[PDB]
């Protein structure tokens, strides 16, 4: 198990534009295209991201490519963020993966605001962090995925994804 597999689980794979949990235009492996209500707009955004006139459909590889770039940007965003980096560097490998998933899902800024959990995670206070992570809108909107991620963060194992 690794970050790629983990996120492929949580996000799924879709070759046609779809709408996410929040009602947004997304494609592939959770590649958000836009917050706008316009399908054309999403289309514009898709064609620019892919380099061709997609008509709203992409191939598997194309999807994998965007995914690769999304994961890469997620790590990098972590590493460039003053509040995130220290926590991450302090964690073991499985737990890092949890932080990456979340960042990928809610953006850096958003995760960067979980002050309190960030601190608890940095102190290796697993259970507390976990309880704290659960007091969030994140958790109330997508609890099944949130539960998987939190378990991972808490235990440092992949049990939630096996
Ligand atoms: Cl892009
Ligand atoms: Cl759910
Ligand atoms: Xe996390
Ligand atoms: Xe966090």
UniProtKB/Swiss-Prot annotation:
It comes from the Viruses. One of its GO terms (molecular function) is lysozyme activity. Induction: Expressed late in the viral replication. Optimum pH is 7.3. Pfam families: Phage_lysozyme. It catalyses: Hydrolysis of (1->4)-beta-linkages between N-acetylmuramic acid and N-acetyl-D-glucosamine residues in a peptidoglycan and between N-acetyl-D-glucosamine residues in chitodextrins. Its EC number is 3.2.1.17. This is Endolysin.
């Amino acid at each position: 198990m690794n970050i790629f597999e983990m996120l492929r689980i949580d996000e799924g794979l879709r070759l046609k534009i779809y709408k996410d949990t929040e009602g947004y235009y997304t494609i592939g492996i959770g590649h958000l295209l836009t917050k706008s209500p316009s399908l054309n707009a999403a289309k514009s955004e898709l064609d620019k991201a892919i380099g061709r006139n997609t008509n709203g459909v992409i191939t598997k590889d194309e999807a994998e490519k965007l995914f690769n770039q999304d994961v890469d940007a997620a790590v990098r965003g972590i590493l460039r963020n003053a509040k995130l980096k220290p926590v991450y560097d302090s964690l073991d490998a499985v737990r890092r993966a949890a932080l990456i998933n979340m960042v990928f899902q809610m953006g850096e800024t958003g995760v960067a605001g979980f002050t309190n959990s960030l601190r608890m995670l940095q102190q290796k206070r697993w259970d507390e962090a976990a309880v704290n992570l659960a007091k969030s809108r994140w958790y109330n909107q997508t609890p099944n995925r949130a539960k998987r991620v939190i378990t991972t963060a808490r235990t440092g194992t992949w049990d939630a994804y096996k």
